[PDB]
Ligand binder design. Structure first.
Ligand SMILES: Nc1ncnc2c1ncn2[C@@H]1O[C@H](CSCC[C@H](N)C(=O)O)[C@@H](O)[C@H]1O
Ligand SMILES: [Mn+2]
Length: 686
């Protein structure tokens, strides 16, 4: 269940969170903020000799645990939750190196008797949340060890933990009883489905228990010589879903002839792709006439030979490569005798954030974004903090290198993303961000928000086929992983900056008559107050589209206001997005640009998080030819197809919006429709 994964999540939360809390407590982070409370990042890193980059990662984690509040001046303060640091006894760090492999084999004595008593005791803590963190340090190593021999199973053919010495039985039983992994029914231990499930999924946390050495020198990472030191399966299920779609397309003639996975690793991804294609798709039934060659790419020869072994009975090829240089790939593929790169489907899985960092190259594009409120945290080889806007700018030119190699078959990219501390806390144990974000930042990997990554592709002409693109975690209001099947499109989409006001005013006049143009004052307001609420569609360096939006407290706040008082609907902590306007030059209408721009903005607002719906008040264009009938009977009309007659309301409704009501005298100056504005809402379903 999700609830059990949450228990797993908070076990692995402490595995990472505890070393750093202790490290911060020893250098005096908490004692400091006990004084001089309001402090900046730079204020502290100077007063502590910290590595600003890695130390910021610690702050994000601590804020995400709501031990620190970060004010609008960006300075931190303690919270009441932060007082519990005093009772985390230091010696718990000894858990990371105990010989539990041998222990289960009966050759370490009563190794885990003193801890298990302290875990049965609430680690002498009056806080169940931290007691689960501490339990992690014991729990994580055990499950890994218990998993090498599937030791956690019910008591039918192997009575639960019956192969083991008397003491191991006694100690583990006392523990599994405390943690609820087993019940002593009928005077004999029998696992609980929690215990069973805790042992089955035991490898989710274990796999990333490889953080141990960095965690042991985490005090170095934060305050000393940091330089010396350096799991859903439906991620891939949906990835396979979109592969079938690609290899069931109309003519086999036009399916990709190559599938190149950047970041082969062991090659498991490629092999799963081929079996999906082999046994399920249409291509799999015509491989003798339309061969398909897998291609593996990776910069470590180690994993290059691991995929030669994995793909060994499969038509494949292997070569060395790097994400940062997609142009060497076509040339290496040229060297390996592939002269039709346009017939390659490109895929990759969770590596763009592990690219070798290039500094940003287009300094004007750097400064446009230097005020946007990114909440990426990233660290340089010197251990200092990289400004978010530099990283994102870096990301864009990284994506542009690839956009210039992407072909008709597109670019299918899974990727992982970080989260705002305020959101991590709200969903602390529903997501694994706290430890994953904390480590991937300590490890000099580069995580950005999902909305920002998708935007980064947008600004270079890469756009997700929303049909084959999926978001995760599906049923929560945050995006932590994205499956995007980026298409290359002949345009670009980007944020509107104040520099764009001249053209956006010119835009507003070419799209509407004077009595319907948006006030220049309004447009200025939209840009200044909604930096990430304004999307622009650029073709050949000119703006040809623009969708405006802001955040509102509710749809009920709207539906009770006139167009003139919209600016007074703005609420920064709103759970709904107001669609302010959708302007497309008449020269370039009837092309789908407006349709695509609309679809993109909706998905952009889904990845931001915390937005249940997108609503707006639109106009009718052809009521003035039917005004004899009421609006509501006109809105009911249908064109030659099964779509609404009116092209404006038609456009939003076809795009999935539902007409929610009519607003009387919303736009009085709109004489054609008698001042009536038609409210709309978009599903926005997960
Ligand atoms: N910058 C880069 N360019 C290309 N491949 C990269 C890369 N950085 C890392 N990789 C690849 O990503 C993979 C590491 S993850 C593979 C390990 C495997 N999943 C396991 O758990 O056992 C390796 O193939 C490595 O070569
Ligand atoms: Mn990584």
């Amino acid at each position: 269940s999700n609830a059990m994964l949450q228990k797993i999540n908070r076990y692995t939360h402490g595995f990472v969170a505890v070393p750093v809390i202790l490290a911060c407590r020893e250098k005096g982070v908490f004692e400091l903020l006990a004084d001089e409370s309001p402090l900046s990042l730079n204020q502290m890193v100077e007063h502590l000799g910290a590595n600003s980059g890695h130390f910021q990662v610690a702050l994000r984690m601590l804020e995400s645990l709501h031990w620190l509040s970060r004010n609008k001046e960006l300075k931190y303060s303690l919270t009441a939750e932060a007082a519990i640091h005093n009772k985390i006894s230091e010696d718990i760090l000894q858990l990371y190196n105990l010989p539990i492999q041998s222990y289960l084999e009966g050759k370490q004595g009563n190794l885990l008797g003193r801890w298990i008593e302290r875990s049965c005791q609430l680690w002498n803590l009056d806080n169940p949340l931290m007691a689960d963190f501490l339990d992690g340090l014991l729990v994580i190593p055990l499950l890994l060890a218990l998993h090498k021999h599937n030791l956690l199973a019910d008591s039918e053919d192997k009575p639960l933990l019956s192969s083991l010495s008397s003491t191991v039985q006694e100690e583990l039983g006392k523990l599994f009883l405390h943690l609820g992994w087993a019940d002593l029914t009928a005077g004999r231990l029998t696992i609980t489905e929690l215990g069973r499930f805790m042992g089955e999924r035991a490898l989710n946390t274990a796999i990333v228990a490889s953080y141990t050495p960095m965690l042991s020198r985490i005090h170095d990472v934060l305050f000393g010589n940091c330089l010396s030191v350096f799991q859903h399966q439906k991620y891939f299920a949906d990835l396979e879903e979109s592969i079938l779609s690609v290899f069931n397309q109309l003519p086999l003639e036009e399916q990709p002839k190559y599938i190149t996975d950047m970041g082969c690793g062991d090659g498991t991804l490629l092999k799963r792709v081929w079996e999906t294609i082999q046994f399920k798709s249409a291509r799999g039934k015509a491989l003798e006439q339309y061969p398909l060659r897998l291609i593996g790419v990776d910069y470590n020869e180690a994993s290059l030979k691991a995929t030669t072994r994995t793909l060994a009975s499969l038509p494949h090829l292997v070569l060395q490569g790097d994400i940062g240089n997609p142009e060497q790939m076509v040339r290496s593929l040229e060297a390996h005798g592939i002269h039709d790169p346009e017939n390659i489907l490109h895929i990759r899985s969770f590596l763009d954030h592990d690219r070798l960092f290039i500094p940003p190259q287009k300094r004007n594009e750097l400064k446009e974004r230097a005020h946007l409120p990114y909440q990426s945290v990233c660290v340089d080889d010197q251990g200092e903090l990289i400004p978010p806007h530099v990283m994102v700018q870096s990301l864009v030119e990284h994506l542009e290198r690839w956009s210039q190699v992407v072909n008709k078959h597109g670019l299918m990219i899974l990727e992982v993303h970080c989260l705002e501390p305020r959101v991590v806390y709200q969903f602390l144990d529903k997501s694994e961000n706290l430890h994953f974000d904390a480590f991937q930042g300590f490890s000099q990997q580069y995580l950005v928000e999902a909305e920002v990554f998708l935007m980064s592709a947008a600004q270079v002409g890469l756009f997700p086929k929303l049909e084959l693109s999926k978001r995760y975690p599906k049923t929560f209001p945050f995006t932590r992983i994205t499956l995007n099947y980026f298409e290359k499109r002949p345009y670009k989409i980007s944020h509107a900056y104040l520099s764009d006001l001249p053209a956006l005013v010119d835009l507003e006049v070419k799209c509407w008559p004077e009595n319907l143009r948006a006030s220049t004052h309004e447009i200025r307001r939209r840009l200044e107050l909604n930096p990430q609420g304004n999307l622009v569609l650029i073709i050949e360096d000119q703006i040809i589209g623009a969708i405006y939006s802001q955040t509102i407290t509710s749809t009920e706040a709207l539906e009770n206001v006139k167009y003139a008082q919209v600016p007074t609907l703005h609420t920064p902590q709103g759970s709904v997005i107001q669609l302010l306007a959708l302007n497309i030059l008449p020269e370039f209408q009837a092309r789908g640009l407006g349709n695509e721009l609309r679809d993109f903005m909706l998905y952009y607002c889904t990845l931001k998080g915390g937005i249940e719906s997108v609503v707006g008040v639109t106009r009718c264009r052809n009521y003035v030819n039917y005004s004899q009938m009421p609006m509501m009977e006109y809105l009911k009309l249908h064109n030659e197809q099964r779509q609404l007659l009116d092209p404006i309301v038609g456009f939003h409704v076809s795009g999935g919006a539902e007409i929610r009501g009519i607003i009387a005298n919303y736009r009085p100056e709109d004489t054609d429709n008698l001042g009536m504005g038609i409210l709309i809402e978009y599903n926005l379903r997960d």
